[PDB]
Structure 1
Amino acid sequence: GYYTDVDGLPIQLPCKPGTFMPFDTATANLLDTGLTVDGTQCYTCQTGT
């Protein structure tokens, strides 16, 4: 659910509304194939969500 951009983050920040982070790159539901979820960027929710 959460994400961390910079290094010295004490607690992992939660994803803001209208965004979603899947558990893994291949265990997502609606992700354009040309991207992956390293864990530092919370992707935007696809059209019709």
Structure 2
Amino acid sequence: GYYTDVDGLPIQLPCKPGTFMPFDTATANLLDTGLTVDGTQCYTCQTGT
């Protein structure tokens, strides 16, 4: 649920409403095939969610 887009951020910023940051790609319940998570990317919610 948190991300650090740029290096040196004092604290991990929270993902804005409408987006989410899963724990890992393997445990990401609703993520497209080509998308991977590394902690610097907030992914928008799918259609219907």
Cα shift at 1:47: 0.3
CA distance in 2 between partners of 1:24 and 1:18 (Å): 18
Cα shift at 1:8: 1.1
1:35 maps to 35
CA distance in 1 between partners of 2:47 and 2:16 (Å): 17
CA distance in 2 between partners of 1:5 and 1:20 (Å): 14
The TM-score with structure 1 as length reference comes to: 0.94
CA distance in 2 between partners of 1:27 and 1:33 (Å): 13
| Percent of aligned pairs sharing the same letter | 100
Cα shift at 1:35: 1.1
Cα shift at 1:4: 0.5
CA distance in 2 between partners of 1:12 and 1:28 (Å): 20
Count of aligned pairs: 49
RMSD of aligned residue pairs (Cα, Å): 0.6
The TM-score with structure 2 as length reference comes to: 0.94
Point out where structure 1 has 5 or more consecutive residues left out of the alignment: none
